[PDB]
A paper describes a structure:
Succinyl-CoA reductase (SucD) is an acylating aldehyde reductase that catalyzes the NADPH-dependent reduction of succinyl-CoA to succinic semialdehyde (SSA). In Clostridium kluyverii and other Clostridia species, succinyl-CoA reductase operates in fatty acid fermentation, allowing for the co-assimilation of ethanol and succinate. The reaction mechanism of SucD supposedly follows the canonical reaction mechanism of acylating aldehyde dehydrogenases.
Our structures at a resolution between 2.1 and 2.2 Å (re-)confirm catalytically active residues and residues necessary for the coordination and binding of mesaconyl-C1-CoA. An active site cysteine (Cys242) plays a key role by forming a covalent bond with the acyl moiety of the CoA ester and releasing the CoA moiety.
Numbering used by the authors:
A (entry chain A), B (entry chain B): 7 to 453
The structure:
Amino acid sequence: IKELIEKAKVAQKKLEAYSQEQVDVLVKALGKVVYDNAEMFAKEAVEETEMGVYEDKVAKCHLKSGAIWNHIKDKKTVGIIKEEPERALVYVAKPKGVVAATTPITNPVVTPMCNAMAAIKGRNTIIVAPHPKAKKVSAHTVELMNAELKKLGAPENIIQIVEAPSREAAKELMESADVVIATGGAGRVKAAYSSGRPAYGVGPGNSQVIVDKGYDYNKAAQDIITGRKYDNGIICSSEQSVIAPAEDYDKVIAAFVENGAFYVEDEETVEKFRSTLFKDGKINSKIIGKSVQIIADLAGVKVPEGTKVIVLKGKGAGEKDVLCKEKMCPVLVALKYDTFEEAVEIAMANYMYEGAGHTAGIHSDNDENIRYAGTVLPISRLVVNQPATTAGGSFNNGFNPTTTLGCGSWGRNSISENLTYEHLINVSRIGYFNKEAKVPSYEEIWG
Amino acid sequence: IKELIEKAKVAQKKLEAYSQEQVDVLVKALGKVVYDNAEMFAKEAVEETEMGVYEDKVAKCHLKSGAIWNHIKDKKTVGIIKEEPERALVYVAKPKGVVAATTPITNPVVTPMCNAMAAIKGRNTIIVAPHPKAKKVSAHTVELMNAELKKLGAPENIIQIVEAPSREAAKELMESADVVIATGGAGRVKAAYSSGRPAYGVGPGNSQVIVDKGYDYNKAAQDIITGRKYDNGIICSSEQSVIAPAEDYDKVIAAFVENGAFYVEDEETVEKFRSTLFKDGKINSKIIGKSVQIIADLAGVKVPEGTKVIVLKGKGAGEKDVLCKEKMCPVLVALKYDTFEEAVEIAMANYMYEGAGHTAGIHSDNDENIRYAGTVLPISRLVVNQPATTAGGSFNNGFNPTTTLGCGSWGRNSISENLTYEHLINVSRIGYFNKEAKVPSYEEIWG
């Protein structure tokens, strides 16, 4: 670990002499090699991690690589980046140093790519600590990235990976680095914020979805199903619930069935799924990232072939049903509401159960209802009229492309936004003297 | 501690219902009570902490309270605060929760005021843990602030203070709160970033000052002396060195003497001061925040009455002289340089010795030299043509008013900027669907 840190600081000092253009050449090639090898990385990730969908991981590598590069290709991250004469200020971008990045099992390819691109964009180095059950495919990602960096003449060891990620080695890695990124479970995030260094983490996901009255239920069903079933639902922003109005409940369910959902209303059968997804109040690890049919066979319930998601009628909001917790599988819980205010209250109770601070989804044409939900819900991202999995960035919304979605103070994170290059640089200020400025008097200040 | 945390959360939920106007009425009164009681607070702080200057602390309470309120009086921090239709984004400001603030001995009055104003501005509550040698005057500041809050009908216990700050109690306080502010020694800051919660801290100061060739050495001397002597030099941004050109060295020294400096060139006499300021490689606590005459008497060197600062010819740059470390007393170390590039290298070596990430000063008419020093020096603030103590805010510069000056990754802090209301709020995003947006093709992205 001490060797990795020193090799990283030697590389960071050489990388600090790079201009904006030389840094941008490295960052682009990092994302392009993930785009060009999307099919291989996806096949390896599905086999090693034993979760997800091959076709969705290919689209994940194609999307995440292009979306992140297209967003940061023109951003100024080296030296003087911004002038503000109205405040007599000049902004200077400076690297933070060595980045310690712990990557998850759900996104073992794009997360090392995303963190490395954002770190090197600001002239930083990075040491990747992969998830144990995904260390092979994450190392292969780092390998091919370093192969492209070598052909461009980059300083050696700007990206390194821990082949033997011992628990004490990760603790020492986060304490020795200058800034920490923790993308994974809450235990990994809490360790990042206990290392004595500035850290960036994530929180547990549990995307609550409200379908407002009068909205196109067919379009809402297509978006929710696309997000819930994506990569077998292991994305932290994936749809977890369907909070539908009681007066149009059967209409909303009919739209879900029309678009490939299997709806279950009987008390039993629903219990057959509930007892299979959750054992002792915690998610069953054997169904994490598994297909609909695997969950169906384990539950002992016949589910038609071609089904995309399973919708379960919930007993109640919050702790009245364990199905209201996060489900890393293509299963949704359905709940009824009378008023839109009660719909927000339902989503609020599920966030207090689990997932507060992350992402919500809403499908509505009432801008007053959309603004009211975003005002009171403890969330960092409200996704409107689109799949909730676009919270990490799409070419059709304004969220910054990323793989590390910070969840604010609710999720015990430093930021309540998507992780970008900007959180890995120190922005300094040159403050000139504004002799023309006037000092306000007592009346001007306290009047 | 558990009782304090729970009472703070109950108050925070009540304060969360406040509109922008109701919060602003509370924030303004918190600063006004420090302004209106400046003379009393300053007298108590000097007597209890046994450091600083009475008249300088009076001016500190007048400036800090008015400048902080004047900066945040019209800032939107509640609910929807910003529209950005070009990205189809709506920004929502939400509180972080309970703030745990540890306040220093150097600024025992303005720091509880500054942190409380920034926290309540964003509908947060705050628990103050004062420095043991300043707990009485810090508690009196909280008392009078709470007295003004009671008259305005504010919810009870939005500001609390620990009267018995145990070491384990301070640890539990930071771990239990939602966000931590640590303004003090590096030991307090390291504990803040070791609590498992998002933390905001400071780093050790050591403001290096470059006097550029051809500048008005008289004005440069007046500004540097003003900053070095303010509050007997306990401000973390106070001038620490005089990096002067060798070709005009005697001219610069004469300008300092003309404006009240006592310059010492005799190595034996410099050693009498050096052996008094530093004992075993560390600063002598008995001279921290003490006057020139107290330091002179302890050093056994006659210094004329009316002397404002002491200037000592240093043995060399960096570790070649302990006088290049942080000196919390009205004493400056003087160093020569040939080229401006060498002057920056000298300041660089002093920052690697101590103080990297904080503040620098420069007095120059050459904008290229100003921009070069800000581009390479490991600093968060470059103060140009004004006393370096204006780094924490001034009506003639663009630095945000504060008492907590973050030092970035160098000082092991989360931000390289002054602490404001904005670092204590979660900024969420409502992301609408931009159906009219175009998806770039492979050529558009990687071309």
